[model samples]
Target: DPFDLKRFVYAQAPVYRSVVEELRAGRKRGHWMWFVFPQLRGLGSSPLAVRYGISSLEEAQAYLQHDLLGPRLHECTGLVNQVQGRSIEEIFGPPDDLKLCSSMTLFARATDANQDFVALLAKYYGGGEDRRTVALLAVT
Candidate 1:
């Protein structure tokens, strides 16, 4: 599945692994830069993995539904919110400040099931102030 491929890349690829490590290490600027570049290049401003056929919005929604429901939805929303540059306090009330940009890139490569979930989550929760937040958080 695409998720497996993405996971493999995350686990095995040096470049991707390094990026993940840097983000985990609190390199927010670098992570954010990587997250936005591909989206801008795609013109649709979608996830980079989507362009490369890794994953899509739909998949993300499905993934969320399975793992996050109810208030957890808000937590996911907060993550999405962070991507938009809103203060974490405003959305989730606190910031893990963890760079998740790489995760969003990896998610783009998820399998159909995962992609479907992601899409649904983005569609329902993504709007207004939530827009940029979701897109930005998505990479992580």
Candidate 2:
């Protein structure tokens, strides 16, 4: 879980529309609002006190071990499941060949564009038919 989850913490608000919506719901139970920093964490002087909850940076380190420098591919899957609310297979479809680190998991979807990119890379790598052809790309 060495991924720098801070990227999401500081990203543009529109990019985090779902997370913001979830936070606005005031679920107050295992919500993903804990991913933003304390300053920007939707504290409207209401019941969203951050004392009992964790910040995005804190959550990153707590679950994903964000500070680590090396690869945490194993932890990546866990975080993906948490945010996506589904198994990687269910969300991204079959053949999970992407070497997803924590950061890349945010956008490593199985979109047609991405699949074509993967296909092209696989073709050049001589593994077009192989489900194990790993594509190391991530979109912003």
Candidate 3:
């Protein structure tokens, strides 16, 4: 599955992989980024993957669901919380009343090369506070 944490991490942009390595090396901390891809009935899903930052996964899913599918609940297809050493199917949730489809939370990290990108992501996205903490701690 594309959402499989291992395969997903491998498939990410090079900058994302660089940041992930930084976090893996303990030079940085983890942050959250949300990506949304819209769909049209019978026309297939959009080629666009809108990226942004978020503070919490659950809260972001709720907000994204409302924005994408309106006030409707339980229509979302899947929710995958990516972590290390796990398969996509293992993390995929059974669709619930307020399922989160077409949305995902990426556990990301920032490095000198990608810090600028992360800053921009947080600027437009939602992880300002958490990103700030990482940025500050980097000085130590």
Candidate 4:
């Protein structure tokens, strides 16, 4: 299974193998820039294989009753929280009655609200909060 892991590195992003291994071992002994660059180049950021997920949404929901909704929660809330730091309340305004689809739904619904987050992510990888990257992301 894609979720089966021998180590902490994401199974889909094997390019991160050595780097993640180093991280998991409590050492920062490699070119960390590779981590951010590659995800931008390829990974599209979906819940199915989103960097930290090791289980399918179905797998994660297999035992739970539907309660007549989608996945019961949008998986992308964590995506916002990961770096944008937007909480569940901020993104979708509390999940007290949330009966939704998957990450795709969350992305569409919340991303427009997180345009700054997009730029922040770009700045993080493009050049570490420099003025040039910030200006570029801001304009386009």
Q: Write the residue-wise lDDT of candidate 4 on 19-75 in tens digits.
A: 445434433344332222211111234543254331333322321222311121221
| Candidate 1 C-alpha lDDT tens digits along 24-116 | 432332332322212212323345434433244554444334432212323433434334444423322212221222233334333343343
Q: Estimate each model's TM-score.
A: 0.28, 0.20, 0.19, 0.25
lDDT of 2 at 139: 16
Clash pairs, model 4 backbone: none
Best candidate according to lDDT: 1
lDDT measured at residue 84 in model 1 versus the true structure, 0 to 100: 46
Residues 1-140, model 2: lDDT tens digits:
33334444444234355534433442222233323322212222344433322234334234333342112322322334344243333433222222222123221232222333333233332423322211222211
Candidates by TM-score, descending order: 1, 4, 2, 3
- The worst-scoring run of ten residues by lDDT in candidate 2 lies at 131-140
List the candidate numbers ranked by lDDT, top first.
1, 2, 4, 3
Which scores better on TM-score, 2 or 3?
2
Pick the TM-score winner: 1
- Clashing residue pairs in all predictions, respectively, total 33, 2, 1, 0
The TM-score measured for candidate 4 stands at 0.25
lDDT of 1 at 123: 40
